[PDB]
């Protein structure tokens, strides 16, 4: 390529303040490893970082330097293996396929249970399979496909995120991994035990859409206040019940429909 372009790409400049309170500009060559940083991690760090008591975000950025370095090390190692890199690159595709499959199986279950572009094409294929194979076999193939899709998604997730780099305790602690293993457990359990269990997978919608999660957060940040208010309502109901029972007991008459 152009000789000046490569050297231009691998050069960076920064500004630092010395112990003498003077500012100095440092031009240095970018390390070869630094080229392997992921864009998703960059965006996550940029948005997630929060101001400290002094109002500067530098502290957290520095504290994350070691984790960032380890992540880039793992990214280079992953880039060494082509197959794993290809699997990791399609994390969004795997997740979208899994969610679409879950929606379709739930829809079919709701419509038929109990029984004896790309999206329209999948709809037509599902309809044809139902017409020929049947509702049962079609649900079976959809469940198996979802199972393999989710297992591949989990593998891609661990490879891309590299949460195992922190340690086994760290990966187990991560809530996302726990949610994903919950998903795989629910999928296998439904495929092998009962079809209705697929309904649980619909909760994945909350994870898929950010706006829905933000809406739910309104009734989650101050959940304690809501529970305490409910307890206050219960206490008032208890006092009202005492007052009624002591004085107005004959008026508490209800209608009941007795089954044969």
């Amino acid at each position: 390529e152009d000789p000046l372009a490569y050297y231009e790409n691998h050069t960076s400049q920064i500004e630092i303040v010395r112990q003498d309170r003077s500012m100095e500009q440092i031009v240095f060559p970018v390390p070869g490893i630094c080229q392997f940083l992921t864009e998703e991690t960059k965006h996550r760090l940029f948005t997630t970082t929060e101001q400290d008591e002094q109002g500067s975000k530098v502290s957290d950025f520095f504290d994350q330097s070691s984790f960032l370095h380890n992540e880039m090390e793992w990214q280079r190692k992953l880039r060494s293996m082509p197959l794993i890199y290809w699997f990791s690159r399609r994390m969004t595709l795997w997740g979208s396929i899994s969610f679409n499959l879950a929606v379709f199986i739930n829809i079919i279950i709701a419509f038929f249970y109990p029984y004896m572009s790309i999206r329209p094409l999948i709809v037509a294929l599902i309809l044809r399979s139902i017409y020929y194979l049947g509702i049962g076999p079609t649900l079976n193939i959809l469940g198996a496909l979802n199972l393999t899709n989710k297992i591949v998604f989990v593998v891609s997730f661990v490879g891309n995120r590299g949460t195992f780099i922190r340690g086994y305790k760290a990966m187990v602690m991560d809530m996302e991994f726990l949610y994903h293993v919950g998903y795989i457990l629910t999928s296998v359990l439904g495929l092998f035990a009962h079809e209705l269990f697929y309904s649980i997978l619909l909760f994945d919608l909350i994870y898929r859409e950010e706006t829905l999660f933000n809406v739910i957060k309104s009734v989650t940040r101050n959940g304690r206040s809501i529970l305490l208010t409910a307890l206050l309502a219960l206490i008032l109901v208890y006092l009202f019940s005492i007052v009624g029972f002591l004085f107005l007991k004959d008026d508490f008459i209800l209608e009941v429909d007795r089954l044969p």
Binding site: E15, V17, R18, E24, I33, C34, K57, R221
Partner: protein, 160 residues
Amino acid sequence: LMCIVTVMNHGLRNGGGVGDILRKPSKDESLFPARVVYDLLFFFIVIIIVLNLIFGVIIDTFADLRSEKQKKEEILKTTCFICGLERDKFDNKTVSFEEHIKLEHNMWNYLYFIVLVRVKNKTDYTGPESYVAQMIKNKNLDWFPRMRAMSLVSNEGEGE
């Protein structure tokens, strides 16, 4: 126990409160005023002032979340990540805020320099590299610029 269960279930769910389920009173009854007061008090306390406090909290949380989000995005898109300077200070100057956050104060360049210091051998350390390495070892974060930019102070050359 059963009276409590009935009151809660059929009074919280019903719009009119517990009064609806109870038997309809008669005008020529001794307890009619008591029933009226009981029903009205229950409706005005447990259905209009208590259940409404469970929905007001949700609205308040919505407002708090919106305000927090707006403040966070404003800070993100107005100030600089590293030095914390504001966009207004850069107006009417040779260098704009866009250039400041792209080349002069690109935090990713700082991360690259930190990686270089960690990787580079101690024998090949330069002056600034050695100083930054010592500061990193000491854990001090003073070497990060804080509300100071060389471009802005460039106008101080005339004063000097």
